[PDB]
Each structure stands twice: as structure tokens, then as C-alpha cells.
Design a protein around this nucleic acid. Structure first.
Ligand SMILES: [Zn+2]
Ligand SMILES: [Zn+2]
Lengths: 56, 214, 203, 56, 30, 49, 98, 56, 237, 119
DNA sequence: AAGTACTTGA
RNA sequence: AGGA
DNA sequence: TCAAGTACTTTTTCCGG
């Protein structure tokens, strides 16, 4: 559907911002790593998890 | 107080497991004797400072009325603890001749840290009696109690002879338990002795396997 | 798996996590330094001028081994300057005189002195200190995570009900040791290394 | 059987040891590969019976 | 690749260690 | 505003075989890896001589 | 790929001659603490020396190749952060036109 | 890729294919899908022989 | 081009991350042991510490990299002049090659011809070869200090493709030199124009026909599959 | 740390304690040179390193096209023209904090909102 | 791609 | 040298 | 006497010139 494609695009769009927000949060040293994981390892886990939740 | 209290807990947990093993081997030990609490343990084997006196702990055990039915020649056992972290040929010769004079069949040395190779030479020196060396730390936890560890049962010479007859077996053909196997040690299995392992089954409900000793 | 009762208590799990997960003096240290501080009763470093004043009131090497500890790191693997220094003092016995800044004090410091030729001696004492000294935990057992695994258990009313519990997950194995640990269930403990299960619990 | 030049003997012996050796196994640890005049090494009896393709 | 080899590379190979107690000059490819 | 160079055409990342694939940007990654193997076993005119 | 080519192999000497003429201090005369920020110059993994203002050198070398004076199959890279200039006359390198 | 700025942890830089197969993939999306694709083909080819020996 | 000395130089950082005395030694071509960098530098001519250190570390405000060079200095401290350094290099064989004059003269040749054979195989280029060794240690320590990542073995820019020409080059070279020794064999024979042109033709023909890129009908290890028959199923094929 | 060499040998200086006057010296093991120490600090280990963060910041750092740009106002000159990168300390642990270099004043400022720097 | 067996210096 |  | 490298071992689905 034409409107379901609008809805799909905006689902990815909002998930892209959910990533940017975590990206800016980690760039500002505000991110707090999960026990037994790098600050980066923790960041990527979130990014990957957002983009996959999004793809679904 | 500090971190002294924890070595007390450990020595007591290790003691329970010794009583547990001895009862399980077929020796007469009460349940209340096993279930003895830590408070009662301190107020028995701790000195005029709360320092545990291992010399006091040592005990003799006797075959349950039931045991003399299956294994008649099953003699008396002597369990010896040591207040010395390293056990030398001097403390060993005391215990070794003790089992020989007091006509014991078996004896267990629950050592703290180590038994010197000098003292270890005296272990097979007094047959028909047998000697066992147990590092206190191994016995803090009873392995037999663990989820994955099933009921092992020692078979009499007659019971084994029958198992072999019933399945038309040579001893070769039986699945094997190693002499050094944690349970083979707990039970005090000797070479050629057979264990009947009764396990639960997702298939049958109850399944009985057998193992011959190494 | 945790002791029968206190299975839903998060702090009980947290407590074991700390008691089991391996911690070295290396993991808490920012940097170690060797200074020539000849007077044992007074320091060249003005920062330390206070640390001495106290750990004196209520012979030794003129060569000082000074290590700055990371406050943030001392928190994650919960630790006291006292308990850290205690390990050091108990490691090197009466042949290494240790002093330390308080947990409250703005910068975290540990001052060490020995009991001709000493420069290299201290570079060996520092190597031991970083690599050999164990603070908390069981060896081989690294990254220890907490997990709230779901557990199907019979309820009083008879029916099997979801009663989840706190479970520890390791990155490394030392069966003999973590089993003898207080506060856990040594009747439930499992390892993906079956060679270990064999060695400890039998064939 | 002739005038044994004694070294020339342990020299001729060692070579017989080599041929009787390589006839059975040609792929030995001690490097020379008893190569047929064509470059191609001689096929050992061991080689014949040796796993997947060949005898057993 | 082949052209760089013929007109260039080949002339160089022909005179690097070439000269013997007899020297090798310019190469010609028919 | 830093661009030192520009791509002639992105489709040039492809080699001989992939270059016969119609709309390869519309296929699952390996389905394309497969056509760049089959076209080599397709019959046609190999040379006019 | 369709546009890909392989470097056939050129002569390094005209570039080594050109470089020394454009401000390249020879390695035999280098003194690290005197010129410490000196961008180090390499031609086929051979350290030839250093150059004080690489910005200009890179520009002169770039327009030398771009004009045609340096063969267009020669590779030249300026890794500013690492303070390095690597040049390849080298045969084998896979190149594409942009 | 050289089409990106340095230290780019964005979805588009690290391989997120936003598009459907119907819409078509961008040159980057195509190459990243290709990298990911090639990984499968490697294990598929490897697993095939590794798995065989286990069976044996 | 010419000979192609496949000599590879390794500059090893001994000791693990947390081991006391972290030395830097290097394995030289036609040399048994691994020489501590400092001896190599003195054998090159760069004799005092700090002159050696100046070649490795280019910033006197980088105590980190410098403290890391303090072991090496202590390691090499036993050797003090160019001679004693060369002798130490010569001692480690060869096999050994006993004679004092022999070992010192050996190591001269190795540094000249075998060690870092690009740059030069000429004489007086100690300055260039030592500054390079120093550039190597700088890069070794830059990675060890977590300032640079370990090299990507799979970077395409660090890979070359030997095409039809160089393939033929390696082969022609092998052949012409086999011909060169055949010309010398007949020149010796003339104890007083019979040059087998077959070797070159037949050799090139053998390789290009079999795909066994190596001398000759006795192929292994010769590298096969190099030359194969052109696919003619379809034009794109 | 910052270590000295012998003026004469140029060979490195090793410490030696003046037991008589309780002061540190640096001696030369090639000759007989001896100088008094400048600092009481002999060796510094540094486990949690911050040196190599703002690595290779040449005055040409703005000329690299591969570098990204931003409109973040500079602390010194307030110029919204700057290049940025992350901690060049190639370690696993390392935070995603950014280092901005002003295209005018050339001052190195960070995006860190936990701490305050100078490098 | 991971072993068994054997030999080498602390 | 290819095919599943 | 025992850790560590040494020799040196061995496999890898199925089917035309
Ligand atoms: Zn001096
Ligand atoms: Zn500014």
C-alpha cells in the first residue's frame, strides 16, 4: 500500500533518530556501559538492536 | 572474629560430608549426627579462643546391622583429621600402626593441605587393611548430592557374579568406572568392584546401568 | 544457581557476583610510580603530606613505590582502599611497609617502601603487585553477569508456576572452587565444559 | 665377496636399506623421496593401502 | 602487461648478470 | 564540501559476468553470485569464425 | 571490475630526482630533534628523506601526474595525521579511474 | 567506503540496507549486502566438507 | 628486478604485556640468533645511546616510548664500539665459521648485501639503513603503545597482481641464467655458436602449456594452474 | 619522566643514591659523569593512558578531506568551522568522545560532558 | 586445525 | 576443468 | 624433576581431458 509505504519509511526514519540520539549520548560521555562490556560494545548492541527491531 | 569464622564453616561443611560418606558407605551414623549444626560444632571442637581442634574431630565407625548381611567381612573404619596443614611421616606412622594394632579393615586421613611423599609411602604398607587420603577442601561440598550425580550402589561378590551370569558377561564387556572417579572414591570402590547406577529416564522412567572399577 | 531460599533477592546475587568474579590490583590502578623519597617521616610529594601525618600517629628504603587507583574502577568491582592495601600488606608480609590514602581523600594513593642496590628490586615488587595480586574473586572466573532466568516450580496450590530467579553466568571455569563458595546452590551448578563435570562430579 | 673396501660396503648396505625402505613406504620423515627418473616419486605399498581412494 | 615485458623488461633481463669472462647487447624480437 | 573525486558510474564495481544481470540491485546477494557462474555455461555465439 | 587496470611498473629515479629538487632533505643529513614535524618521504618502501612543507610538495606532485609529467599509473598518498608521504612506481597495484 | 567521512557510526555507513528489494539497493547498500552475502557462501562452502567428516 | 633476495626482516618485541624486561631483538638473514637492535645500530656505526634513541623516537617529549627503550639500551650496553658489535653479529653463524677476522668481515657483508636489501646493497648507506630500522622500531612501539592498529593483512592496497608479463619475466630470468651457465660450461669445454636455443623455447613452451611455472619436467614445488585453456562456451565466458 | 644523557658520552643516565647527603644522582656507566636529579620521580608506569588521544594534530589537519566537519562554536574564537575525530588511542575500552580542532585558532576542544580537558 | 609423542634446559 |  | 618447544602426525560430502 501507498500509505503503508509512508508508514514503513517513517518507522525507519524514527528508528534512525533513536540511533542518532544514542550516538550523540555516547559522543558526550553520558553513556554508561553494561557490566562486563566496553562502552562501545554497549553502544553497538543498542544500535544493532534498534535497526533490527526496525527491520521487523 | 574476621575471616577466621569462614574456615570454621568450611571445616564443619567438610565434616558433615565425611559423616554423609561414612553413613553412605554402610557405617552406622545417625541422621541427627550428620545434621549437627555449626553452633554445636564450635561448642565441641573449638578451643579456649574459637580455634578448631581437628585432633578432637577424629572418630571410629561401625558397620550398620544391615551392612553385615550384604558384606560380612566389612570391618571397622577409622577417620583421622589433622591440626597440622602438612602431614609428615611422624604423624602418619602414629595413624598407620593405630589401624594395624586396633585390627581395622579401613582408615581415612582427612588432610588439610598436603601429605609429604615420605608419609604417602606408608599408605599400602599395612594390608589386609586399606588407607584413604582426602583433601579436606574436596569434601567441603558433597558431590553425591549434585543434580547430575545418580545413585551408585556397591555390589557384593555374589551380586556381581549373578549380574555377570544373567547378562552372559566377561568383566571386559561391562562399562567401566575409574578407581579415581569422584564417586568411586566416595564409596571407596576397589578394583573389580561393581556399581549399579540407578538413573531417571525421559524414555523409561528409571534405568539401571552397571560399572566395574579400574 | 543461588541458595534455595534467597533466589529472588538481587542483592544476594550481587553479593556472590562480587565474591566470585576475579579482580586484580591491575584492574583498579591508573599508574604506578617510583620516587626517591629519602625521609620516611616526610614526603617530597606535597599531596601525600597529609597521608603520612595520620598513618603515623593514632629503617626502611628511601625508594618509594606510589600507585594511583581509579575511583570509578574501585566502584564497579566494589572495593575499599583499606581492603586493597590489606591484600598488598598481607601479600608481601612484614618486608613491605604500606600506607594508603582514605576512601574519602580526593586522590586514591598507596605508598610502599621495602625493609646497596634497590631500583630494580621495586620494579619487580610492582610487577608482582599488578600481575600476581588477587583482590576479590576466584581465578579463571572473569566477566560475571546476573540473569533473571524464568523457573517453573510447583506452587502450594499444586500447579506449576513461573517463579523466576537470579542466576550467575561466568566467562571462565574453575569448578572445584566456585562450588565450595557460600550462598550458592552446589546441587544445581552447571558448566558447558563437561570435561570439568567429569573430573569433579564423576563419569 | 670380493676385496671389501669396508666403507664402500657400509655405503652399498645403506642404499639397499633405502630401497627396501622406500619400496614399502616412500613418504618418510627423512626428506629424500626416491623419485622415479621422470621426477614423479615411486608409489610405496603403504601409499596403495592409504586412506580414501586405494585398497581399504 | 605483455607489451611492458617485450619492449622493456626483456631488454633488462638480457643484461643484468649477463656479461661473462662475452657480453649481451641489444635484443631484437621478430 | 570536501569531495576530491566523483564516481564515473557505480555500476562499474561489477565485472564482466555480473554486468549481464538485469536489475541486480533487486536481487538477494548470492542469487547474483550464481548468475555470475551460469552465464559461463550458457550457449550462444562465442565468435563469428 | 570493468574499469580496473593493473600498474605495469615505472622508473622511480625521475620522481626521486624531482623530489630532491622540490625540497627533499636526504636521510643521510636528517637530524630528528631539529626538524621533528618533518613529513617523511617514501618511494617504493625506501625512506628517501623528509620535507618541511609537504602541502605544496603534494600539490606540485599531483599536478605533475595530472598534467602527464609523472605517469598517471603512479600512486602518491599524503597521510597528514601520520606525517607521511608514500609514492608507488610499483607494478601489480590495481587502479580504477575516477 | 571512500564515499564516507571518517568516524561514521551511522546506520548507512555501517551496512543498514534501508530499502526493499522491490525499491532497489543503493551502490553502498549493494556492496554491503554483497560482503554479508559472501560470508554465507564461505560458510556454506566450508560447512559442506567440515560436516561430512563429522558424519564419517 | 635482478636476483630477487626473498630475505624478510623481523623486528621482535620480546616479553608479554605484563612481563618485566621487554627487550627488542631482530632476526637477520644468514644469522642464527636475534640481535638486540642496539648492537645492530653500533654495527651500523650509530654508537652512543641517544644517537641510537634519536633514530627510533623522534620526540624527546615522549617519555612513554623512551622508557620502553631503556631495556634495549641495557641489553646492548655490553657492546660498545662498531667492531665488538660486528664480531657479536659474526659469532652467531653462518654455522660459526671460527676465526676472529672471519666473523667481523662476514658481519659487514650481511648488513651490506642481506639486511634491508632494498634502499641499497651498495657500501656506505648505514645512515639510510639505520634510520629505516629506527622507523621500523617506531612503528613497532606505536602499535604496542596502542596508538596505531595492527596492519590489515587483507588490505587490497598492500596486494599486487602478477599479470602475464611479470609471470613470463620470472620464467625468462630462470631460463636465461640456466643458458648463461650452459654458455660458461661450453666456454670451459673450449680449452683451445653451440648455444642451445632449445632451453629458452622449450622452457617457455613447457610452462605456458602445462601451467607448471617452474624448471622443468621435474615440477614440484613449481606452482600449477597459472596457465589454463581459454573458455569458449559463450563470448562473456 | 623526561630523562637526560651524559654530556661527554651521550650514553644514557642510570640513578645512584648519595647515601651521605640523602639525594638522588644520575651516573654514566661508560665514563665517570654524575649529575644531581631534577625530579624525585624516577619511573612512571601509566596503565590508564590519556597520551595519544589528540595524536598527530598537524596544522594541516583541516586539509584532510576524509575528515568530517561541524558548526560547533569554538571556546577561544567562537568559529563554527572545525574538523573532528575520536580518541586516536587504538584501545578497546576507549570512549566515543570527540575532539574538535578549530580551523582558525587551532584550539583542541572536546564534546565530553562528564569531564573538562586542556589537550 | 588441532593434536600425540618426544626431547630440552631450569 | 565443472556439476548437486 | 617438570614446563615448554621440538619432531611430526593427520583429516576434509557426492558425481571430464
Ligand atoms: Zn658518560
Ligand atoms: Zn577557535
Amino acid at each position: 500500500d501507498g500509505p503503508t509505504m509512508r508508514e514503513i519509511t517513517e518507522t525507519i526514519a524514527e528508528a534512525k533518530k533513536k540511533v542518532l540520539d544514542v550516538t550523540k549520548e555516547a559522543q558526550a560521555n553520558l553513556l554508561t556501559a553494561k557490566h562486563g562490556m566496553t562502552l562501545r560494545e554497549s553502544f553497538e548492541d543498542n544500535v544493532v538492536r534498534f535497526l533490527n527491531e526496525a527491520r521487523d | 572474629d574476621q575471616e577466621n569464622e569462614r574456615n570454621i564453616s568450611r571445616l564443619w561443611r567438610a565434616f558433615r560430608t565425611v559423616k554423609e560418606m561414612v553413613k553412605d558407605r554402610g557405617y552406622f551414623i545417625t541422621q541427627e549426627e550428620v545434621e549437627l549444626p555449626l553452633e554445636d560444632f564450635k561448642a565441641k571442637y573449638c578451643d579456649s579462643m574459637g580455634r578448631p581442634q581437628r585432633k578432637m574431630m577424629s572418630f571410629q565407625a561401625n558397620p550398620t546391622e544391615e551392612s553385615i548381611s550384604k558384606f560380612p567381612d566389612m570391618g571397622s573404619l577409622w577417620v583421622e583429621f589433622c591440626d597440622e596443614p602438612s602431614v609428615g611421616v611422624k604423624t602418619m606412622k602414629t595413624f598407620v600402626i593405630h589401624i594395624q594394632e586396633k585390627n581395622f579393615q579401613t582408615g581415612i586421613f582427612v588432610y588439610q593441605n598436603n601429605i609429604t611423599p615420605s608419609a604417602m609411602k606408608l599408605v599400602p604398607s599395612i594390608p589386609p587393611a586399606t588407607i584413604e587420603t582426602f583433601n579436606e577442601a574436596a569434601l567441603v561440598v558433597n558431590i553425591t548430592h549434585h543434580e547430575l550425580v545418580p545413585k551408585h550402589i556397591r555390589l557384593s561378590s555374589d551380586e556381581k557374579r549373578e549380574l555377570l551370569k544373567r547378562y552372559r558377561l566377561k568383566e571386559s564387556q561391562l562399562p567401566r568406572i575409574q578407581r579415581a572417579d569422584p564417586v568411586a572414591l566416595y564409596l571407596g570402590l576397589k578394583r573389580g568392584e561393581v556399581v549399579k547406577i540407578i538413573r531417571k529416564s525421559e524414555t523409561s522412567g528409571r534405568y539401571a546401568s552397571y560399572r566395574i572399577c579400574m | 544457581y543461588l541458595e534455595p531460599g534467597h533466589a529472588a533477592d538481587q542483592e544476594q546475587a550481587k553479593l556472590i557476583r562480587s565474591a566470585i568474579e576475579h579482580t586484580t590490583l591491575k584492574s583498579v590502578t591508573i599508574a604506578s610510580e617510583i620516587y626517591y623519597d629519602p625521609d620516611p617521616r616526610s614526603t617530597v610529594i606535597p599531596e601525600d603530606e597529609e597521608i603520612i601525618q595520620l598513618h603515623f600517629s593514632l629503617q626502611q628504603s628511601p625508594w618509594l613505590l606510589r600507585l594511583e587507583l581509579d575511583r570509578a574502577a574501585m566502584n564497579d568491582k566494589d572495593l575499599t582502599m583499606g581492603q586493597v592495601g590489606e591484600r598488598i600488606k598481607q601479600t608481601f608480609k612484614n618486608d613491605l611497609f604500606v600506607i594508603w590514602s582514605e576512601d574519602n581523600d580526593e586522590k586514591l594513593i598507596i605508598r610502599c617502601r621495602v625493609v646497596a642496590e634497590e631500583d630494580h628490586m621495586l620494579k619487580k615488587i610492582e610487577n608482582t603487585m599488578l600481575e600476581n595480586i588477587t583482590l576479590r574473586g576466584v581465578e579463571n572466573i572473569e566477566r560475571v553477569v546476573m540473569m533473571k532466568y524464568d523457573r517453573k516450580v510447583p506452587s502450594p496450590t499444586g500447579e506449576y508456576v513461573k517463579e523466576p530467579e537470579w542466576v550467575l553466568e561466568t566467562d571462565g571455569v574453575n569448578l572445584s572452587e566456585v562450588m565450595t563458595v557460600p550462598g550458592i546452590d552446589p546441587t544445581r551448578i552447571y558448566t558447558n565444559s563437561f570435561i570439568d563435570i567429569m573430573e569433579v562430579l564423576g563419569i | 665377496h670380493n676385496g671389501a673396501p669396508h666403507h664402500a660396503i657400509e655405503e652399498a648396505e645403506s642404499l639397499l636399506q633405502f630401497h627396501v625402505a622406500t619400496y614399502m613406504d616412500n613418504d618418510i620423515a627423512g626428506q629424500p623421496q626416491a623419485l622415479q627418473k621422470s621426477g614423479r616419486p615411486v608409489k610405496s605399498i603403504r601409499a596403495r593401502l592409504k586412506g580414501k581412494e586405494g585398497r581399504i | 602487461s605483455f607489451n611492458q615485458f617485450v619492449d622493456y623488461t626483456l631488454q633488462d633481463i638480457i643484461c643484468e648478470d649477463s656479461t661473462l669472462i662475452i657480453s649481451f647487447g641489444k635484443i631484437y624480437v621478430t | 564540501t570536501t569531495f576530491t573525486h566523483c564516481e564515473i558510474h557505480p555500476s562499474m564495481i561489477l565485472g564482466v559476468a555480473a554486468s549481464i544481470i538485469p536489475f541486480p540491485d533487486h536481487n538477494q546477494s548470492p542469487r547474483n553470485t550464481y548468475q555470475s557462474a551460469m552465464g559461463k555455461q550458457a550457449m550462444g555465439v562465442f565468435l563469428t569464425n | 571490475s570493468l574499469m580496473s587496470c593493473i600498474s605495469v611498473g615505472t622508473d622511480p629515479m625521475p620522481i626521486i630526482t624531482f623530489l630532491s629538487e622540490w625540497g627533499m632533505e636526504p636521510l643521510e643529513d636528517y637530524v630528528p630533534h631539529q626538524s621533528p614535524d618533518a613529513t617523511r618521504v617514501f618511494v617504493n618502501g625506501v625512506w628517501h628523506g623528509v620535507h618541511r612543507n609537504p602541502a605544496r610538495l603534494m600539490e606540485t606532485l599531483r599536478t605533475l601526474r595530472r598534467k602527464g609529467d609523472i605517469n598517471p599509473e603512479v600512486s602518491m598518498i599524503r597521510d597528514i595525521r601520520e606525517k607521511e608521504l608514500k609514492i608507488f612506481t610499483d607494478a601489480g597495484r590495481v587502479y580504477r579511474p575516477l | 567506503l571512500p564515499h564516507f567521512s571518517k568516524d561514521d557510526y551511522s546506520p548507512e555507513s555501517k551496512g543498514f540496507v534501508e530499502n526493499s528489494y522491490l525499491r532497489g539497493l543503493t551502490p553502498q547498500e549493494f556492496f554491503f549486502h554483497a560482503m554479508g552475502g559472501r560470508e554465507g557462501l564461505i560458510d556454506t562452502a566450508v560447512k559442506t566438507a567440515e560436516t561430512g567428516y563429522i558424519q564419517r | 628486478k635482478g636476483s630477487r633476495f626473498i630475505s624478510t626482516l623481523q623486528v621482535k618485541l620480546y616479553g608479554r604485556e605484563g612481563s618485566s624486561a621487554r627487550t627488542i631483538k631482530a632476526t637477520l638473514p644468514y644469522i642464527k640468533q636475534d640481535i638486540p637492535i642496539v648492537i645492530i645500530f653500533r654495527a651500523l656505526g650509530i654508537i652512543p645511546d641517544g644517537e641510537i634513541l634519536e633514530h627510533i623516537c623522534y620526540d624527546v617529549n615522549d617519555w612513554q616510548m623512551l622508557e620502553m627503550l631503556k631495556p634495549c639500551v641495557e641489553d646492548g650496553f655490553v657492546i660498545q664500539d662498531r667492531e665488538t658489535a660486528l664480531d657479536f653479529i659474526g659469532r652467531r653463524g653462518t654455522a660459526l665459521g671460527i676465526k676472529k677476522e672471519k666473523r667481523i668481515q662476514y658481519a659487514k657483508d650481511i648488513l651490506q648485501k642481506e639486511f634491508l636489501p632494498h634502499i641499497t646493497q651498495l657500501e656506505g648507506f648505514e645512515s639510510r639503513k639505520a634510520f629505516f630500522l629506527g622507523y621500523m622500531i617506531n612503528r613497532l612501539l606505536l602499535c604496542a603503545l596502542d596508538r596505531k592498529d595492527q596492519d590489515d593483512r587483507d588490505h587490497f592496497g598492500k596486494k599486487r597482481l602478477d599479470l602475464a608479463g611479470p609471470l613470463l619475466a620470472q620464467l625468462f630470468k630462470t631460463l636465461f641464467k640456466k643458458l648463461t651457465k650452459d654458455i660458461f660450461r661450453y666456454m670451459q669445454r673450449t680449452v683451445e655458436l653451440a648455444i642451445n636455443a632449445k632451453t629458452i623455447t622449450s622452457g617457455l613452451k613447457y610452462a605456458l602449456a602445462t601451467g607448471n611455472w617452474g624448471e622443468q619436467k621435474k615440477a614440484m614445488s613449481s606452482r600449477a594452474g597459472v596457465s589454463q585453456v581459454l573458455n569458449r562456451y559463450t563470448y562473456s565466458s | 619522566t623526561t630523562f637526560r644523557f651524559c654530556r661527554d658520552c651521550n650514553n644514557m643516565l642510570y640513578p645512584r643514591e648519595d647515601k651521605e647527603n640523602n639525594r638522588l644522582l644520575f651516573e654514566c656507566r661508560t665514563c665517570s659523569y654524575v649529575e644531581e636529579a631534577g625530579s624525585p620521580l624516577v619511573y612512571r608506569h601509566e596503565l590508564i593512558t590519556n597520551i595519544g588521544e589528540t595524536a598527530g594534530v598537524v596544522q594541516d589537519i583541516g586539509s584532510d578531506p576524509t575528515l568530517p566537519r561541524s558548526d560547533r562554536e569554538c571556546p577561544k574564537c567562537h568559529s563554527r568551522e572545525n574538523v573532528f575525530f575520536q580518541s586516536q588511542q587504538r584501545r578497546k575500552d576507549t570512549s566515543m568522545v570527540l575532539f574538535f580542532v578549530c580551523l582558525s585558532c587551532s584550539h583542541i576542544f572536546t564534546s565530553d560532558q562528564k569531564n573538562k580537558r586542556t589537550q
